[PDB]
Amino acid sequence: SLSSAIAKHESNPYRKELQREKKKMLQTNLKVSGALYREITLKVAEVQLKSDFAAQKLSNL
Amino acid sequence: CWFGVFSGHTLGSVISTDPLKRFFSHTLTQILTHSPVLKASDAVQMQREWSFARTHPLLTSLYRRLFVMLSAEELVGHLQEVLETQEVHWQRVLSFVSALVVCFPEAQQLLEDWVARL
């Protein structure tokens, strides 16, 4: 849900002059909202806590 | 609609261009190789019919899309390799070079390069 939520934030002579225009539209958005990423890391942290809690009952037994 | 989704604006955005590039290369090879009918060395007058304006606009658009998501000199090397290796559909290769020379930024000299080597 991290990488998917990020992957929505990224979406946000004549033939040379169309080729270059379509290259311009798809110039790799290398960039991702830190704020969003942070939102999700909290949501994840939440879950980590239970899962880690779970491992400890298990690596008891 | 099939060539529309092929247009990697909805795809290339989402998909990392590693396995996407091998997909496009396999797609180009499978367009050229498959049904190599009109293998006649006498396919000379048929160049006029494989002229860029007569080759269907959808073929032309697919070629444009494959050129967007890939690079020029890679593509030239790949063509040299393919045309030297194996059989060809001459309809697609002649339409393809007809699109190549105009679409790519002066690739008439990188073309005459492997022409001279051959």
Contact partners, residue B101, CB within 8 Å, separation at least 6: B107, B108, B111
Total length of chain B: 118
What's CA B17's distance to the chain center, in Å?
A: 18
Contact partners, residue B113, CB within 8 Å, separation at least 6: B76
Name the residue among B82, B85, B23, B86 with its Cα closest to residue B97.
B82
Cβ of B102 under 8 Å from any chain A Cβ?
yes
Contact A15 B99 (CB under 8 A): yes
Nearest-Cα residue of chain A relative to residue B60: A15
Amino acid at B63: Y
Cβ of B105 under 8 Å from any chain A Cβ?
yes
Q: Which tokens go with B56? A: 């269907």
> At B21, phi and psi to the nearest 5?
-65, -45
Nearest-Cα residue of chain A relative to residue B8: A26
Burial degree of B50 (CB within 10 A; 0-12, 13-18, 19+): buried
Nearest-Cα residue of chain B relative to residue A8: B14
Contact B13 A13 (CB under 8 A): no
With helix as H, strand as E and coil as C, how does B21-77 read?
A: HHHHHHHHHHHHHCCCCCCCCCCCCHHHHCCCCCCCHHHHHHHHHHHHHCCHHHHHH
Cβ of B44 under 8 Å from any chain A Cβ?
no
Name the residue among B96, B100, B38 with its Cα closest to residue B73.
B100
Total length of chain A: 61
Residue numbers in A near B99 (CB within 8 A) = 15
Contact A19 B14 (CB under 8 A): no
CB B58 within 8 A of CB B104: no
Residue numbers in B near A29 (CB within 8 A) = 13
B89 secondary structure, DSSP code: -
CA B80, B81, B86, B90 torsion-angle sign: negative
Resolution (A): 4.2
Per DSSP, the three-state class of B16 is coil
